[PDB]
Amino acid sequence: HMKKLLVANRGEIAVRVFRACNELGLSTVAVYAREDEYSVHRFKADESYLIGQGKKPIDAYLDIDDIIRVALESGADAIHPGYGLLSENLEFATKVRAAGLVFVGPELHHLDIFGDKIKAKAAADEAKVPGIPGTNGAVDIDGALEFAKTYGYPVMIKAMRVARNDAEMHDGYARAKSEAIGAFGSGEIYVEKYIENPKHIEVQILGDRHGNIIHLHERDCSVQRRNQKVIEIAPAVGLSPDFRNEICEAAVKLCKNVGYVNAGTVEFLVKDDKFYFIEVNPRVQVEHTITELITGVDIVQAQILIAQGKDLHREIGLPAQSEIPLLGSAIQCRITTEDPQNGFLPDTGKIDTYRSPGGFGIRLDVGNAYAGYEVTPYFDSLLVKVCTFANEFSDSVRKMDRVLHEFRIRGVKTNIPFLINVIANENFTSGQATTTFIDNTPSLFNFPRLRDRGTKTLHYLSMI
Amino acid sequence: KFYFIEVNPRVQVEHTITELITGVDIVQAQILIAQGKDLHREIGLPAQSEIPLLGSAIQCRITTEDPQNGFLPDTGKIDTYRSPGGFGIRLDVGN
Amino acid sequence: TVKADLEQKIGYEPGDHEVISYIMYPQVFLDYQKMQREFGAVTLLDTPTFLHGMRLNEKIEVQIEKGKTLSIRLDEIGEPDLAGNRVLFFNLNGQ
Amino acid sequence: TVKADLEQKIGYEPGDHEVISYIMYPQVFLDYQKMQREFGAVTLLDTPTFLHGMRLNEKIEVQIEKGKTLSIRLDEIGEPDLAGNRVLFFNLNGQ
């Protein structure tokens, strides 16, 4: 079938894929903006080609035509989109298949239905998986109270104000139409049930062309700040086996029902033993790493094999749903340039020092974080994804703590101080954190001033 | 048939792979045992038959042994080294 | 009043001696804190180093605690760029 | 006779054209092989580079195959040591 693969992406996830390709004896092809000419992923591939010429750097990684131009002149049989950029884009998926190239991903149907939040909520109802109660569309004020009447309080008003009460609802819905007449301009006003202090829990899904559909357990991504994922764990050690099994089964259900293909993730919110579909990610996620660790299933390999038409169980080699392993726990932290003593503004500059730790229970999916690399302002801030893993979640924590402390990254600020505080915290170590845990724990933002004696001395020695 | 030849009263260089296929941090265990602790009660290991066996693992020692010079360990300044990674890779790095 | 006022200005709780140094010599004490923040414990440097920096290819050890030491070789001094900057190439602890 | 004799002298099986080049210009062909072993495919360099090397802070790309290229910045030129050696500090492909 397939001899060569082009990754329509960059950085850690581009390198992740080349690795999976290489292991499957596929040749690789990388694409890079001018501004990214120094990125690792450019040189980690068998051949690489400039794109987006003259454009802004992010625009270049979005230049659908120019990518395919390259895909073709290069001889590629397939394209892996990665995550973010064009990976969820229908126009791209369509045009790629259109030019007789394999797009490693799900069916154009799936991109379409799950890319739009109304058709998805629709397809979820059809599938008989409970979503977030919403006013089926925007509503008059007698209707907002009707909505709150069934389902109950609190609830959330979106143009978005919270409303624990009939009083607050009038207050909210009229202040929304004022906030709404001078902000976008328009004020059709929908209301959704509101889900106070939820765990965010998602389920990893594989399906092939032959109708098979398995889950790779779940991932608890509750540890967010300003609803930005900071740390993901796996499984959700906070919740009981059976309740977890039930959330997973419901994502199989949703996906059997649309006959999902390739890899994808089913996001839920969770609260006191009920759960609410919120999304589907028709792609591989940044946090796929940890699920791989707890199952033993190379997800990016599987992705690719699925797109060669192969069968999950017969050729690829995966066991039946109930025989899919669950080997202890795993944790991921993205080490970024987000300076936490400067309100998480991603630092830029030349990186002077980086060595990558290792040993038992450590996994490193490294981005562009090396000695001498100029961190530019153009791309996201990620330096390196760190996973740890161990039978006992207590020990997965121990290893993460050691590693974050072992890192010596000089040249640019990083978020490590923040991460250290977070894995120190008893709410986290217990496996019970919620989405509001970080924003409601002010203690996490007291950071020890660090003495860097090496650096300062060398500054002095140099000055003199 | 099988024939005892030795015992190594220590940790071995190749312990790594056993750790990987069992999930048991051996060097941790080593240390905890020397604090008097109990394999099953405190340390937390299951009974012999419940000890896991999770696929396979392989180790290679990358040395300076030049194989086109009869494996005579090369010396000199190292100019480049970056350590690879990703799923299913473990690195216990030397100097 | 002063202790609180100072804690804000240097960003930690000052000991009684810092307070009183501040009372005695306010400007100088704050400047000293900038210097410390920019340059660290220069106190630990041998005097010739502290006063002359380093010579090309010179090696030094700076003891900082018991059993912790900065080994510092200097290997090259770059020419200045257009912005009047130079790049010095050290080996600190084998990096 | 010559083909065998040459294979030994350069360490691979020479194509018919190498053989005949060797017959035509023996010394020169061997010297060319030294140069190739020491310096590689200098052919691929732009002529000004090939003849003048690089300037401080200069950046160049050398195409070696379709879709494979050496990005080479030059960042500093060391002073010589006692043995009359210098150290040049490049960034080749972000290393």
Side-chain angles (χ1 to χ4, degrees), chain A residues 353 355 410 453-454 456-464, chain C residues 36-39 42 49-53 64 90 94-95:
Chain A
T353 287
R355 299 257 195 71
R410 268 68 128 258
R453 285 174 279 204
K456 284 161 168 215
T457 297
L458 289 174
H459 185 30
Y460 186 77
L461 290 177
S462 297
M463 183 70 169
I464 304 317
Chain C
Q36 278 295 295
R37 235 177 299 114
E38 178 171 13
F39 294 121
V42 296
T49 288
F50 166 95
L51 290 171
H52 304 318
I64 328 144
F90 294 100
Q95 258 184 346

Side-chain angles (χ1 to χ4, degrees), chain C residues 15-82:
Chain C
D16 298 320
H17 63 273
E18 279 157 312
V19 179
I20 195 80
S21 284
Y22 175 51
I23 301 171
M24 292 301 323
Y25 281 112
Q27 203 38 60
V28 172
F29 186 66
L30 298 170
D31 301 356
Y32 156 74
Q33 287 283 358
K34 277 153 213 167
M35 295 295 86
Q36 278 295 295
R37 235 177 299 114
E38 178 171 13
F39 294 121
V42 296
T43 328
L44 309 180
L45 298 172
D46 55 282
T47 296
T49 288
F50 166 95
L51 290 171
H52 304 318
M54 294 179 66
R55 259 179 286 97
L56 205 96
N57 297 323
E58 176 172 33
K59 195 162 153 18
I60 80 181
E61 307 213 357
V62 171
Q63 191 93 207
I64 328 144
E65 354 187 59
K66 225 182 66 96
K68 267 251 170 75
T69 152
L70 306 187
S71 310
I72 297 186
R73 208 178 57 242
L74 174 74
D75 289 319
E76 205 67 58
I77 304 167
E79 294 298 348
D81 69 27
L82 84 157

Side-chain angles (χ1 to χ4, degrees), chain D:
Chain D
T1 304
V2 175
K3 175 169 178 180
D5 160 42
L6 186 71
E7 171 158 10
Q8 175 279 301
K9 283 177 190 261
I10 61 178
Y12 58 99
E13 206 204 352
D16 301 319
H17 65 272
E18 280 158 311
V19 178
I20 195 79
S21 285
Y22 176 53
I23 301 171
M24 291 300 323
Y25 280 111
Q27 202 37 62
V28 170
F29 185 66
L30 298 171
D31 301 357
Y32 158 76
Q33 286 283 358
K34 277 153 213 167
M35 295 296 86
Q36 279 295 297
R37 235 177 298 116
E38 179 170 14
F39 293 120
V42 294
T43 329
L44 307 181
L45 297 170
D46 59 282
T47 295
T49 289
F50 167 95
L51 288 172
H52 302 316
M54 296 178 67
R55 259 179 286 99
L56 211 106
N57 296 325
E58 177 171 35
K59 197 160 154 275
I60 79 182
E61 306 214 358
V62 171
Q63 193 92 208
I64 329 143
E65 295 180 351
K66 224 179 74 184
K68 309 192 185 286
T69 152
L70 308 186
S71 309
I72 296 187
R73 207 177 57 239
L74 173 74
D75 289 320
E76 205 66 57
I77 304 167
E79 294 298 348
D81 71 24
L82 84 157
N85 289 306
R86 287 171 176 257
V87 167
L88 304 225
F89 293 73
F90 293 100
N91 172 286
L92 169 113
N93 295 352
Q95 258 187 342

Side-chain angles (χ1 to χ4, degrees), chain A residues 305-326:
Chain A
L305 293 170
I306 287 164
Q308 295 165 345
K310 292 188 150 67
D311 190 276
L312 289 180
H313 310 282
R314 283 200 309 271
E315 295 151 299
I316 289 173
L318 299 178
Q321 192 52 57
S322 87
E323 249 42 40
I324 273 162
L326 218 179

Side-chain angles (χ1 to χ4, degrees), chain A residues 213-282:
Chain A
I213 289 194
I214 61 163
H215 71 80
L216 288 177
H217 310 287
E218 77 289 3
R219 281 197 288 276
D220 175 343
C221 314
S222 314
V223 182
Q224 326 186 20
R225 174 190 57 81
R226 260 73 116 149
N227 311 101
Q228 242 63 6
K229 278 156 170 176
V230 172
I231 298 171
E232 312 79 8
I233 71 165
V237 288
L239 313 172
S240 54
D242 291 31
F243 183 45
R244 279 156 50 190
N245 188 224
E246 191 180 308
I247 302 148
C248 292
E249 292 285 38
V252 173
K253 203 226 180 137
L254 170 51
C255 289
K256 258 155 150 88
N257 197 87
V258 300
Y260 191 85
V261 176
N262 219 304
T265 311
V266 176
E267 302 194 4
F268 294 86
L269 287 191
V270 179
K271 193 156 166 63
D272 307 87
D273 299 298
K274 303 178 197 269
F275 53 86
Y276 315 97
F277 164 97
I278 46 166
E279 240 198 348
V280 165
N281 295 109

Side-chain angles (χ1 to χ4, degrees), chain A residues 128-141 143-148 150-157 159-160 162-183 185-187 189 191-193:
Chain A
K128 306 227 199 189
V129 195
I132 283 164
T135 56
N136 67 243
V139 182
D140 74 304
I141 180 70
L145 296 95
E146 206 199 350
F147 174 65
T150 1
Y151 310 136
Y153 280 130
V155 306
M156 164 78 63
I157 315 149
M160 54 207 62
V162 178
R164 210 156 289 87
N165 225 21
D166 262 314
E168 302 186 15
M169 168 82 69
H170 286 277
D171 182 54
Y173 176 124
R175 286 247 271 92
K177 272 167 171 304
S178 319
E179 266 164 352
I181 279 156
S186 34
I189 301 274
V191 181
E192 47 221 342
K193 171 51 146 310

